[PDB]
Design a protein around this nucleic acid. Structure first.
Ligand SMILES: [Zn+2]
Ligand SMILES: [Zn+2]
Ligand SMILES: [Zn+2]
Lengths: 337, 408, 595, 159
DNA sequence: CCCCCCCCCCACCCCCCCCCCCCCCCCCCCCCC
DNA sequence: GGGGGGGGGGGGGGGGGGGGGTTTGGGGGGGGGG
């Protein structure tokens, strides 16, 4: 099936370079190492997993570069336009630049360290003439974009019925009431299969609501020996991510006269899970996305959340004033005679 | 390869069946009961034999009974082989239904009098394939249907016939044509007249009312009846069963002609499943069933009674003031109330049902009401009749409905 | 120079793990646990110096039972096994395989070290399980997350319901269609390793093997829906629930309504998009795969049985917090004892009605008795339906009284209950069973409950110038169903009111009384004491009934006297009814029958 | 029954053997053994029993191979001791056993040498024309009755 | 206490699969050294 | 007398084709009003 192609006004090589430049340079200098590299040292210590990017930081960096007389190609517009792809770009930049840990971890206790060390040892045994992994497997953190402040489309809180099809791919922000919340369930980022007949594990990344499991060992260890070994899934070695779904509905006041209240599925992943509960009235930033059902199913990949909603010394302020029972009783509904 | 264990089990069972010796309250003219029962089957041209489990248990150090208890499902064909040889030895007329071809006769080995009754809640899968006895109350009974027992087919492209095709839980067809001049695999027509069927009836049981631990929901089990045991049970009856605890696969998932696979876990890899994975129910394959909860001529009743029972009836009619003794035998837990006891006797004896020249029926039954204070013995009269009389039922005036009374 | 057995993904040597566990399974002393934990001051040699898990293994061998229960904290006390606790919590399947095999190995080691006559063949036949428990903090069901997915966890929760037992194939059985040779295959990770050609080289036909289903060998599996308790929820939103798989003899270890702990490996599995396809849905199903479960003697009994004050001693213990009212407490004590039974109908029940004002403590007495009894129920009679109290409609489900089969049924507000519902309780008190007949449902539903009714005079007060029948407004023969009927009244008396106020206000001063011993004593009496009647009881039974019959009475009083005398004869473990039992049964009835 | 008990004990030995070769817990319970070889490389198997017995692990790894060497194959006469499975036996009824053994006894005691002389003194002639079936049946006759009389004479000095 | 109400319960593409064909390997037989 | 080469059988792989994947009425039970 041949495909046509077109030229477009973007370049992900140039923007990848811009993203890593931002990452290794920026700090919140108006408040006077880089914010993001320091935060990635916290990630390297395994003290943090929620990597938050502020679009305001990107905007400040763009303004700093433009002030220094070079065009920054408006990365804010690009991430507000095709947000999902720039998750991949930002994560690749982090994986290419994150510094080593400082705090001790007891590194062998993670199965991924042992299994990838064993694969490296095996690959060195091969490499004496006698990627190592898909990066999502090793990537422990979760990356989220946080919207622009008032000062731009990501900043505006849309009601659900204003979310039209032209917004698909954009990092929009929605407003409504959560009518339902799912229980948490795990979802596979990367499946790890053992191979029975050679022990060389193999990996499948999953990027859809369904997949088909592997059967035959595709590794060179088996394939060169034409040994049709069988693959078995391991939950120990597979990377899971926490998944949860929530149904958001527009506010009852926003419903036009006679219309049914419109609603949307929000999907939330990683550490951002269980930030929402039913009956919450909330603003949520996310990528508005299609899903396989020409009519597509659709959902919002959540990224950032804004909910709408000492003492034992301070009690002495009333105790010292005296007759507190009589006064506190008189403070019960003072508007009632 | 022949299973020497099964062959030796067959030999031991065959010897038992032909010469197991016992007699009681008589000289030692041993009846050799199961040989005599083959003769009884031959006289009445039956197709089943009833075996007491304890008789096997005492026989030859009990090893045969232990084996047939533990691993019944392996050893049942070997038992039928032994039985077939014994019946040939002492009653060869029974080997056919008994010129037009009389089919070979099938034989059911109905065990009874097992050491213990396991509850439905005691079902545990190591007892799969073992002979047990089971109890519960029957909630519903299926239509009696013909199970295809052993099948016969003719090939579509040559009119050769395959025969004696043993059936799995699926309707099973031959894989290869017997004719080496023919090419066929899997294209067949069933010869109905040559194929063999069994009367078949599924019945579902549930855990007994007094045995449910705290009056909660009872547990349920599917039971299979076949042959002469079908349609003996009834809904609401409380029954003891004996037979084999068995697994039953999801036959649709296994693949079945004319049916799609059905669309917690099963098991996969087996060739017939391909990608699919198979699940199993548990069921009880019953060989014998009994409950644990009229004659209109004197001869047809009296010919069922023993000689000493006949003597009891003779003493009863000889004792011509028996009429008083009967009334005093009514409701023995209740003191006094002789008039009620007399009426209860006359109700249980009833009048005579009659039909008139115009078709009008005239009632035979006698209807009685016993009026009294609630401290009186009144309810014990009802519980006596309910405990004593055949085909009798008990309910309360409150906590019952017109539907539950006549019919719903 | 040699291969190494490694727990995959961990670099743990399995041989070293095995030795580290073996050297704890033997030579461990329970004192080491008291060195690890609190209560270190209470080390006691004659209970702590035993080789505790060899004591377990020897008792286990004498009983011939497969299971060793193992508190996980004990691994941290023994020096060579501290690391193995962490290995267990992080890699439970492999460590538990090691522990199971080591238990079986140690059973062999003990009989061969002792060179004992116990069957080696039995030990070799027997499978052996460790059941580890008390793993750690019982983290909430709501809090489980992808890091837990292979760990051992422990959850507190409520069982909503369970499946029937499900057969799980552990060994497949393959028979050759050509040559009738048979072979066995252990199921590996749910996959049948089918032989592609027949094993016998003299046959070796391809695709000739077929699965003989009922000659395969099966383990037991059961699935149970375990709910987050409504106690622990953030109360504005629903409780969660989790499926758990429970296996072999752990099947049916719990029932609907049980609050339990379950200790197990957390697990996850994919689920198919369509059973006709290999295609899997991205988000896995999750379940806990359990290895241990938990809910929520006579020498002492004989010592108490010899006491002379034992009648009052047991009577005070039922409710020492309430005013002493000891005729009521003694009558209830006889209701807790019960009589005896005869199958030829009658029952060894006892039935009581607390009349008196609504302004008295009888409801609290009922509350304590409902706590004391093993299997009772509590409800109240106002607006109580004849079917709601009893059994209701498709299936019929049991009501409160039927759920109280074999225990005390407390019913408050009994005087306000409609005559229809009383008409159902007639056959409870007369036959202790319910003779239903409705559309599709006919049954004699057995319900052997000792009713403890609490009732009132009509209106705000009892009239002292009238008998109890004229006050209570329930008809006399309904009162004659019950054994004892009592008046407890609020009438002013400064002596009684002072001593009651003192009795009540003494509760706030202090830091057989306890109900645990009372209910144990009643239980042991029910298991052991079944009094037969002596002629010295018969004579007074016949005489006393004929007395109150020409005071005007019925045989239900005589039957009540019999059941009460048998209940009285369960005191002092007497096990024989005599004159005094009848005298007290009669005497307490003389307090009641005066009306 | 005595011999049946003996047989059942013998196959109960195979029961305890397969039980040793069987998991103590359910099939979905399987953890992973890794066999690190004497070299710095690793294999993987799911056998819970194999996890504590490397012999089982090694042989199970070998059982897992899908490959096999392909094996190549290998009428006017009846089935016999020439082509039956080596454990096959006729399970006589004891009356038929007595009747058959006494019949062949009396045959050996009368008809054997005379018959064998007659037919072998035929088969001296016409060997070139002796049909294959006739050859094999003659040889089997010879072998069977010679073997029987040797065995009976080992059992009976009277023979 | 009796009757009426009302509530419940029920009746087009992609994957798996199977069939057909072609090639390659392995054994047996014959010739050559 | 053993090893190579030629010829025939048998098995495995790969490709191609095909099929499958909520309203309305009635009875009976249960509860409330005259
Ligand atoms: Zn491999
Ligand atoms: Zn044909
Ligand atoms: Zn075979």
């Amino acid at each position: 099936a041949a495909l046509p192609s077109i030229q477009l006004p973007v370049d992900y090589n140039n923007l990848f370079n811009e993203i890593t430049d931002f990452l290794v340079t920026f700090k919140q200098d108006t408040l006077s190492g880089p914010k993001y590299m320091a935060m990635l040292q916290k990630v390297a210590n395994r003290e943090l997993n929620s990597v938050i990017i502020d679009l305001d930081d990107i905007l400040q960096y763009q303004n700093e570069k433009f002030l220094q007389g070079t065009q920054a190609d408006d990365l804010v517009s690009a991430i507000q336009q095709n947000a999902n792809h720039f998750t991949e770009l930002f994560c690749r930049a982090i994986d290419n630049n994150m510094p080593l840990p400082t705090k001790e971890i007891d590194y062998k206790d993670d199965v991924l360290d042992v299994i990838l060390n064993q694969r490296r040892l095996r690959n060195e045994r091969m490499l004496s003439d006698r990627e190592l992994f898909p990066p999502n497997l090793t990537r422990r953190y979760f990356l989220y974009f946080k919207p622009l402040s008032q000062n731009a489309i990501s900043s505006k809180p849309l009601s659900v019925r204003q979310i039209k099809g032209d917004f698909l791919g954009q990092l929009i922000t929605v407003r409504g009431i959560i009518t339902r919340v799912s229980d948490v369930k795990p979802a596979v980022e990367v499946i790890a299969y053992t191979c029975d007949q050679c022990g060389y594990e193999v990996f499948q990344e999953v990027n859809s609501r369904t997949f088909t499991p592997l059967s035959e060992c595709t590794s060179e260890e088996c394939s060169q020996n034409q040994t049709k070994g069988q693959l078995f899934m391991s939950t120990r070695a597979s990377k899971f991510s926490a998944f949860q779904e929530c149904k958001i509905q527009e506010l009852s006041q926003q419903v036009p006269v006679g219309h049914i209240p419109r609603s949307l599925n929000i999907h939330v992943n990683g550490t951002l899970v269980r930030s929402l509960s039913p009956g919450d009235i909330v603003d949520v930033t996310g990528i508005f996305l299609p899903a396989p059902y020409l009519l597509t199913e659709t959902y919002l990949e959540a990224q950032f959340v804004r909910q709408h909603k000492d003492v034992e010394e301070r009690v002495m302020e009333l105790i010292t004033s005296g007759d507190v029972y009589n006064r506190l009783a008189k403070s019960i509904a003072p508007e009632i005679y | 390869v022949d299973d020497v264990t099964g062959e030796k089990v067959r030999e031991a069972f065959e010897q038992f069946l032909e010469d197991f010796s016992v007699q009681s309250t008589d000289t030692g003219e041993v009846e050799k009961v199961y040989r005599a029962q083959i003769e009884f089957m031959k006289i009445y041209d039956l197709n089943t034999i009833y075996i007491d489990y304890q008789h096997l248990s005492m026989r030859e150090n009990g090893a045969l009974a232990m084996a047939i208890s533990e691993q019944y499902y392996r050893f049942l064909p070997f038992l039928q082989k032994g039985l077939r040889r014994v019946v040939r030895k002492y009653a060869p007329e029974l080997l056919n239904t008994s010129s037009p071809e009389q089919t070979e006769r099938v034989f059911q080995i109905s065990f009874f009098n097992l050491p213990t009754v396991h509850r439905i809640r005691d079902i545990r899968s190591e007892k799969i394939g073992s002979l047990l006895s089971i109890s519960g109350t029957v909630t519903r009974t299926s239509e009696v249907r013909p199970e295809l027992y052993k099948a016969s087919f003719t090939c579509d492209m040559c009119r050769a016939i395959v025969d004696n095709v043993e059936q799995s839980f699926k309707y099973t067809e031959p894989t290869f044509c017997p004719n080496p001049s023919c090419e066929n695999r899997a294209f067949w027509t069933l010869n109905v007249t040559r194929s063999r069927f069994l009367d078949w009836q599924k019945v579902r049981i549930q855990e007994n009312a007094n045995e449910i631990p705290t009056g909660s929901m009872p547990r349920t089990l599917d039971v299979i009846l076949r042959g002469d045991s079908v349609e003996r049970a009834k809904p609401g009856d409380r029954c003891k069963f004996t037979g084999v605890e068995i697994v039953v696969p999801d036959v649709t998932q296994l693949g079945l002609p004319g049916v799609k696979p059905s669309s917690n876990s099963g098991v996969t890899g087996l060739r017939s499943l391909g990608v699919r994975d198979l699940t199993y129910k548990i069921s009880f394959l019953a060989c014998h069933v009994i409950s644990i909860g009229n004659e209109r001529d004197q001869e047809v009743f009296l010919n069922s009674l023993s000689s000493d029972e006949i003597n009891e009836l003779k003493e009863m009619v000889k004792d011509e003031h028996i009429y008083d003794k009967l009334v005093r035998s009514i409701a023995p837990a209740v003191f006094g109330h002789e008039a009620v006891k007399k009426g209860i006797l006359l109700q249980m004896l009833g009048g005579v049902h009659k039909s008139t020249v115009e078709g009008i029926k005239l009632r035979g039954d006698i209807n009685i009401c016993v009026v009294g204070d609630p401290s009186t013995s009144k309810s014990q009269f009802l519980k006596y009749v309910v405990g004593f009389a055949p085909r009798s039922v008990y309910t309360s005036g409150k906590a019952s409905s017109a539907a539950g009374l006549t019919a719903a | 120079s040699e291969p190494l057995r490694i727990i995959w993904g961990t670099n743990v040597s399995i041989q070293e793990c095995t030795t580290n566990f073996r050297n704890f399974l033997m030579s461990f002393k329970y004192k080491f646990r008291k060195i690890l934990d609190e209560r270190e001051e209470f080390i006691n040699n004659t209970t702590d110096e035993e080789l505790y898990y060899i004591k377990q293994l020897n008792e286990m061998r004498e009983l011939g039972t497969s299971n060793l229960n193992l508190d996980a904290r004990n691994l941290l006390a023994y020096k060579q096994t501290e690391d193995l606790y962490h290995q267990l919590l992080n890699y439970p399947q492999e460590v538990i395989s090691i522990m199971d095999q080591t238990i079986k190995d140690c059973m062999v080691s003990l009989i061969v070290d002792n060179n004992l006559d116990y069957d080696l063949d039995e030990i070799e036949t027997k499978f052996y399980k460790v059941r580890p428990y008390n793993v750690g903090s019982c983290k909430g069901m709501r809090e489980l997350n992808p890091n837990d997915i292979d760990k051992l966890i422990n959850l507190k929760g409520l069982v909503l319901r369970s499946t029937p037992v499900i057969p799980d194939m552990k060994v497949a059985f393959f028979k050759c269609n050509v040559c009738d040779h048979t072979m066995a295959v252990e199921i590996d990770r749910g996959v049948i390793q089918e032989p592609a050609r027949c094993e016998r080289i003299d046959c070796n036909e391809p695709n000739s093997m077929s699965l003989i289903h009922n000659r395969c060998s099966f383990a037991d599996k059961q699935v149970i829906k375990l709910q987050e308790t409504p106690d622990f929820v953030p109360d504005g939103q629903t409780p969660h629930s989790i499926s758990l798989c429970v296996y072999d003899e752990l099947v049916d270890s719990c029932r609907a309504g049980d609050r339990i702990e379950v200790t197990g490996t957390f697990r996850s599995i994919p689920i198919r998009a369509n059973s006709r396809q290999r295609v899997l849905k991205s988000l896995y199903k999750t379940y806990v795969d359990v290895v241990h479960v938990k809910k929520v003697d006579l020498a002492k009994i004989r010592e108490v049985a010899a006491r002379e004050d034992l009648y009052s001693l047991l009577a005070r213990s039922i409710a020492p917090s309430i005013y002493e009212l000891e005729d009521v407490k003694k009558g209830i004590l006889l209701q807790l004892f019960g009589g005896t039974n005869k199958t030829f109908r009658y029952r060894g029940d006892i039935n009581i009605l607390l009349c008196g004002d609504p302004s008295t403590s009888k409801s609290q007495i009922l509350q304590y008795v409902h706590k004391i009894t093993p299997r009772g129920v509590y409800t109240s009679g106002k607006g109580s339906s004849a079917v709601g109290l009893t059994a209701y409609i498709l299936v019929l489900e049991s009501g409160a009284l039927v759920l109280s089969d074999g225990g005390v049924c407390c019913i408050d507000e009994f005087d306000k209950m409609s005559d229809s519902t009383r008409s159902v309780l007639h056959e409870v008190m007369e036959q202790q069973t319910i003779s239903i007949a409705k559309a599709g449902i006919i049954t004699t539903l057995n319900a052997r409950s000792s009713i403890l009714a609490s009732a009132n005079p009509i209106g705000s007060r009892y009239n002292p110038n009238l008998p109890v029948t004229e006050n209570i407004d329930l008809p006399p023969p309904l009162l004659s169903r019950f054994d004892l009927v009592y008046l407890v009244l609020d009438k002013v008396d400064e002596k009684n009111d002072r001593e009651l106020a003192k009795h009540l206000t003494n509760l706030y001063l202090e830091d057989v009384l306890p109900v645990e011993f009372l209910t144990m004593y009643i239980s042991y009496a029910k298991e052991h004491i079944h009094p037969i009647i002596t002629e010295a009881a018969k004579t007074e039974l016949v005489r006393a009934y004929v007395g109150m019959r020409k005071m005007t009475a019925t045989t239900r009083q005589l039957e009540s006297m019999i059941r009460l005398a048998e209940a009285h004869a369960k005191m002092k473990l007497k096990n024989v009814v005599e004159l005094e039992d009848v005298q007290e049964a009669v005497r307490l009835i003389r307090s009641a029958i005066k009306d | 029954g005595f011999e049946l008990s003996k047989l059942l004990q013998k196959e109960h030995q195979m029961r305890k053997n397969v039980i040793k070769h069987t998991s103590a817990r359910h099939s979905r319970f399987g953890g992973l053994l890794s066999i690190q070889t004497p070299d710095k490389t690793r294999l993987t198997v799911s056998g819970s029993q194999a996890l504590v017995d490397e012999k089982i692990a090694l042989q199970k790894l070998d059982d897992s191979k899908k490959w096999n060497k392909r094996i190549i194959k290998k009428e006017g006469l009846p089935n016999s001791l020439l082509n039956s499975q080596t454990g096959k036996a006729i399970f006589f009824t004891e009356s038929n056993g007595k009747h058959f053994k006494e019949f062949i006894n009396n045959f050996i005691d009368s008809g054997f040498n005379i018959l064998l002389h007659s037919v072998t003194n035929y088969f001296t002639t016409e060997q070139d024309r002796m049909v294959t079936l006739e050859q094999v049946e003659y040889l089997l006759f010879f072998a069977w009755f010679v073997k029987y009389q040797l065995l009976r004479s080992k059992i009976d000095n009277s023979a």
